[PDB]
A paper describes a structure:
N-myristoyltransferase ([name]) is a promising antimalarial drug target. [name] cotranslationally transfers the myristate moiety of myristoyl-coenzyme A (MyrCoA) to Gly2 of protein substrates after removal of the N-terminal methionine.17−19P. vivax and P. falciparum express a single [name] protein, whereas human cells express two closely related isotypes, HsNMT1 and HsNMT2.20PvNMT and PfNMT have more than 80% shared identity, while the human orthologs are only about 40% identical in sequence to PvNMT and PfNMT. Small-molecule inhibitors bind both PvNMT and HsNMT1 in the peptide binding cleft, where residues contacting the ligands via side chain atoms share 100% sequence identity. The inhibitor binding site is located within the peptide binding cleft formed by the N- and C-terminal domains.
Compound 10b adds additional volume in the core A group via the naphthalene moiety. Tyr211 adopts the selective conformation described previously. However, the bulkiness of 10b causes an additional “vertical” displacement that relieves hypothetical clashes revealed through structural superpositions. There is an accompanying rotation of Phe105. The displacement of the pyrazole group of 10b causes a more significant outward shift of the Ab loop (observed at Asp98) and weakens the hydrogen bonding with Ser319. The morpholinomethanone group anchors to Asn365 via hydrogen bonding with the ether oxygen in all asymmetric unit chains, despite conformational variability observed within the morpholine ring itself. Despite its volume, the naphthalene group does not displace the waters that extend the channel to the Tyr315 side chain and Leu409 carbonyl sites, although differences in the water structure are observed between the three chains and the occupancies differ. A second hypothesis is that the bulkiness of 10b introduces a number of additional binding site perturbations that have a compounded effect on selectivity. These include the more extensive movements observed at the inner wall (rise of Tyr211), Ab loop (outward displacement of Asp98), and “pommel horse” residue (rotation of Phe105).
Numbering used by the authors: 27 to 410
Write the structure that this text describes.
Amino acid sequence: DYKFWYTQPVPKINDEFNESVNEPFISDNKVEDVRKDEYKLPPGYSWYVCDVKDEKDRSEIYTLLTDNYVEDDDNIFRFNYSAEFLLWALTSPNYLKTWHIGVKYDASNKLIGFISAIPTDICIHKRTIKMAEVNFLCVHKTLRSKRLAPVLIKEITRRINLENIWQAIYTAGVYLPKPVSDARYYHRSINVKKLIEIGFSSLNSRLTMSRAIKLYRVEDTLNIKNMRLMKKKDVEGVHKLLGSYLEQFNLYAVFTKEEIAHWFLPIENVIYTYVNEENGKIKDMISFYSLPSQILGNDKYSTLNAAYSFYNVTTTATFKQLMQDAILLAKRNNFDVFNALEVMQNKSVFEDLKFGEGDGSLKYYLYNWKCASFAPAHVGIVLL
Ligand SMILES: CCCCCCCCCCCCCC(=O)SCCNC(=O)CCNC(=O)[C@H](O)C(C)(C)COP(=O)(O)OP(=O)(O)OC[C@H]1O[C@@H](n2cnc3c(N)ncnc32)[C@H](O)[C@@H]1OP(=O)(O)O
Ligand SMILES: Cc1c(CCOc2ccc3ccccc3c2-c2ccnc(N3CCNCC3)c2)c(C(=O)N2CCOCC2)nn1C
Ligand SMILES: [Cl-]
Ligand SMILES: [Cl-]
Ligand SMILES: [Cl-]
Ligand SMILES: [Cl-]
Ligand SMILES: [Cl-]
C-alpha cells in the first residue's frame, strides 16, 4: 500500500509526467521552518552521530552492515563493504558528519540502525540541482518490520533540510514510488571455478567445466597499450574527459576538480582507476570499485571478490575494447567477477563480452522532483 511513502513528496505509483516537466513537488522551502528537534524513538534507544574518520565508530558501522546489509534473493550472498570503503564513500568533499546517522540500543551500547547521505550536484534534464545522495540504510535483523526505516529516513531528511537542501537521489533493488529509470544488472565471470563451487554459475552437457573455463579465459594483453593507474597529475585531464562525456545523458553528477580527485584516485581494495595519456592529454579512462559479498554458510570460501563498473570513457578506441580491458584489469587485481548495469553505453558490449543477465534490476529514484521516466541508456550516474 506504501502507507509511509504516500505521505512523502514523491510520485504516486500511477503517476507519469511529460518530458518537459522538470521541477520540484514542493518549492520555496525555508530552513527556518524545519523541525529543530530529533524524531522520537522507542524507549531504550538513542540517536548517535557517527565520526567515520574514527576507527571505533567506523568499525561499529562496518559490523552493522557486515551482519545485516543486503542479501541476494537466494540468501547465499551478503554485501561486505570494507571499513576503508565506507571511509571513502562518506568523506567526499564538503561532507557533513551530521549526515552519518545511527541508532543505538542503550542497554548494550550496540549499533542497530544506520543511514547516510552526502552532498552532490546532480543534473536532471539539463538542470543542475544541489542534492543529497542517500545510501547504507540498514536496520538490524532482530528489529525488522517495526517501522524503523521511516524514522531513519525522516530524521536524515530533517538534517538535510537544515542545510537548505531539498532534493535527494537514491537507488534500491526493491520497487518504491517511484523510479525515474530501471536498469538490469549483468555479471562477467572471471574465476569460473569459484563461481561454480559456490553455486552461482551453472553447467550442462553443452558447457562442461573445462569448456566453461576456456570460454571465459581472457587474454592478458591490453587493447590500450598505455593504460596505467591514475595519479594526482591526471585530475584535470579526467575532469575534462569525464565532464565532456556525461553531458549527453539525462541524469548525471557534475564533478568539481576536488570531487574528481576523491572519487577516482586509486585506493587498494576500494577504487581502481586507469587512464591513457597521449600528447599530454587524458583521452581514455577505466574505473571500478570493490564490493565483496560474504559467501553465507560456505566452509571453503568466505567472500566473493566482485568488481563493479563505475565510469568508463574512450575517445581513441571502441567501447568494446575499453570494457574488455576493464575486465582484464579486474582480473589482474584478483577479482572473481565483473558486474555492470545497462546504463550509459554498457549494454552495447554485454553480448560480445559474454555478460550474463542477473535476476533483478536497480531502480533510480529522486526525492521531491517531478520529471518523466526514461530508459536506463539515458542514465549517466553510478551510485555505490
Ligand atoms: C531532501 C532530502 C531527502 C532525504 C531522504 C530521501 C529518501 C531516502 C530513501 C532511502 C534510501 C535507501 C538507500 C539504500 O541504501 S538501498 C538498500 C537498503 N538496505 C538494505 O536493504 C539492507 C537489508 N535490509 C534492511 O536493512 C531493512 O529491511 C530496511 C532498512 C531496508 C527496511 O526496514 P524493515 O524491512 O525493517 O521495514 P520497516 O518496518 O522499517 O518499514 C517499512 C517501510 O520501509 C520502506 N522501505 C523498504 N526497503 C526500502 C529501501 N531499500 N529504501 C527505501 N524505503 C524502503 C517500505 O516501503 C515501507 O514503506 P511503506 O511501504 O510502508 O510506505
Ligand atoms: C544483493 C546481492 C546480490 C544480488 C545481485 O546484485 C547486483 C549484481 C550486479 C550489480 C551490478 C551493478 C550494480 C548493482 C548490482 C547488484 C545490486 C543489486 C541490488 N543492490 C545493490 N546494492 C545496494 C544499493 N546500492 C548499490 C549496491 C547491488 C549478490 C550477487 O548475486 N552477486 C554479487 C557479486 O557478484 C556476483 C553476484 N550479492 N548480494 C549481496
Ligand atoms: Cl512525453
Ligand atoms: Cl599489456
Ligand atoms: Cl565510444
Ligand atoms: Cl543472459
Ligand atoms: Cl526514454
